[PDB]
Design a protein around this ligand. Structure first.
Ligand SMILES: [Mn+2]
Ligand SMILES: [Mn+2]
Ligand SMILES: [Mn+2]
Ligand SMILES: [Mn+2]
Ligand SMILES: [Mn+2]
Lengths: 269, 258
């Protein structure tokens, strides 16, 4: 099953414990996020981009997930655009992605965050290692969306990203520096995953099953990771230009993807 | 299904390190390991494809690590595993082994009988008797199940009743020192080998060919637990998913070991 797979145990105790508790009360969270996804495809805004102190450069986790969702929205008949930092706009350039300009929540039917910084309790922005983030914020549009009642979906794997506000108690208690770094920003639905890109892929995968088409077909993890890495995006852990995500090498990410595609094909047949 | 996942969720929340702890025990008693497997599917009472593959995977890992292994199982399964030249247990006594493992084997319920997950009574010579003796003797024991009616589940009987249909009647009362719960039993066994690989620094799963093992045992007469037919699948799920599971585990091990 998809929610369980994208939360595969990868040696990160914090995220696993959060997932366990989160799913105890919200067993169908991925299903609900999907239902909200499918119902508002008209015009989707995807937000991604996570600055890595002390360089404050964006990492490899997030954009791939955004591209996958972007891809799925277009294939489903909707329209999508991406709000993110410049280094990320450059990395996604080859993929012919509609970039968002002067966006206001009103203009969208659904807004999704894939690994984006969420302001903490003190109104500041922190990394998982408690270092403060200094880069113009992107969560602002989610607050306006919540106030307007516009559908929102968050995807995260740490506790300091947009959407984590819906389960801050789980973050404070299961993650180091939690109380200080846990984002306060909420979304209508939330997807927790071992790696954010997988959360994004899981959404795409669950949607694939409900529409009867494998929306992941054609996706090439290695090609995408290597492109955005050659383009300047760093690995979150090594903080270097290695073609990897969250310090984990490509065969693992590639394996997740390929397994999701199989799980989807098997479910549609 | 929804049951197993809910039972896994609770168990993992309660025992965060159950797989790691199972692996420690495994790695510590490899001198002579007895692996038990074989689950009859009512009404035909023939063994299914879930279990034998996992048992075979452990058997192999035990030998690659220098220990010795033997298999206690039903006749059709012995036949099904004949091509792999696995040592078959004869008149097995508890005392003779340093470790006893079960991969998808029926455990007696509270009323002393055996039931499938659909509450049908299993009628065939039992294999759990040695686990009862093993724990009374103090012999290390590990169980791998994915339903709640398998050997080792007696350890979490409460979790089984609160999430599995027919629970009270079918939940196995048979305990085991360490217990592995997984969506499919075979994957529990591979997880064990993957975890052992990480602890040892060697990919013990390298070379594992899910396709061959399942088509082989299927050709030999082992039916699919869900469809109850001779399809090359396990738990009603086609091979491309199991190949994917295995491939994913092989990469995770590489990630840790390199
Ligand atoms: Mn994160
Ligand atoms: Mn990440
Ligand atoms: Mn690494
Ligand atoms: Mn079972
Ligand atoms: Mn099974």
């Amino acid at each position: 099953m998809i929610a369980h797979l994208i939360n595969t145990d990868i040696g990160n105790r914090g995220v696993l414990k959060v997932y366990l508790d989160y799913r105890r009360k919200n067993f169908n969270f991925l299903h609900n996020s999907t239902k909200m996804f499918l119902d508002n495809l008209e015009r989707v805004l995807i937000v991604t981009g996570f600055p890595i102190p002390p360089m404050m450069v964006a990492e490899t986790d997030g954009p791939p997930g955004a591209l996958a969702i972007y891809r799925a929205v277009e294939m489903l008949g909707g329209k999508a655009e991406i709000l993110t930092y410049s280094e990320v706009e450059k990395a996604l350039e080859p993929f012919g992605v509609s970039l968002a300009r002067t966006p206001e929540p009103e203009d969208y039917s659904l807004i999704i965050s894939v690994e984006t910084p969420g302001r903490a309790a003190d109104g500041r922005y922190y990394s998982m290692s408690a270092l403060e983030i200094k880069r113009d914020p992107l969560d602002g549009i989610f607050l306006k969306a919540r106030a307007l009642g516009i559908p929102t979906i968050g995807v995260g794997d740490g506790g300091n990203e947009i959407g984590m506000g819906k389960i801050r108690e789980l973050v404070v208690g299961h993650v180091p520096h939690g109380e200080k770094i846990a984002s306060v920003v909420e979304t209508d639905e939330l997807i927790v995953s071992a790696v954010s890109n997988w959360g994004a892929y899981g959404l795409v995968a669950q949607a694939s099953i409900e529409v009867g088409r494998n929306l992941l077909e054609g996706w090439d993890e290695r090609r995408v990771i290597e492109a955005i890495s050659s383009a300047g995006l760093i690995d979150g852990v090594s903080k270097t230009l290695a073609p990897s995500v969250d310090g984990i090498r490509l065969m693992v990410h590639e394996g997740i993807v390929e397994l999701l595609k199989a799980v989807v094909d098997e479910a549609i047949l």
